[PDB]
Design a binder for this molecule. Structure first.
Ligand code: ZN
Ligand code: ZN
Ligand code: ZN
Ligand code: ZN
Lengths: 73, 74
DNA sequence: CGGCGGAATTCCCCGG
DNA sequence: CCGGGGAATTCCGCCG
């Protein structure tokens, strides 16, 4: 019944404050500590789902932050 | 000098599969044309393809390859 | 020779 | 951790 609030894939639980799948959990972790600067090839509104989440780390990371994901939480 | 890749605008290494392109776009088209051919765009299918952003959308990059006229028979 | 196709190699993101 | 797979550079075979 329950889905990841970022990519809509089935969630593994509440990670960093937000209900997410394992891949988004690990992605957000790597993004914050990598101090990554991502660039969208689109309009920064990109569709993020199970398949398309690979395409735009920028919009995926943005969705993580907007969903409320945080390292200390 | 110089000449630019007609796909991503990076410097072109020569004429590959009929079109002036960089090395990276050469091997990309090779992989894509023999691949699963299912690529999906997360955008509006207008995604900007340049040296920085060409990794982001295989679908749009492949489309630009085709539009530029790239083919295996060349 | 130089140009092109292409395989091989290296690098890195992704996800189980 | 690990393996899978794409990206891009490197290296080689062929031919005009
Ligand atoms: Zn997710
Ligand atoms: Zn995007
Ligand atoms: Zn190119
Ligand atoms: Zn696109």
């Amino acid at each position: 019944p329950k889905l990841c609030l970022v990519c809509s894939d089935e969630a593994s639980g509440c990670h960093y404050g937000v209900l997410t799948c394992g891949s988004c959990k690990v992605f957000f972790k790597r993004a914050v500590e990598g101090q990554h600067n991502y660039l969208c090839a689109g309009r920064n509104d990109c569709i993020i789902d199970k398949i398309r989440r690979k395409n735009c780390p920028a919009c995926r990371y943005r969705k993580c932050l907007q969903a409320g994901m945080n390292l200390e939480a």
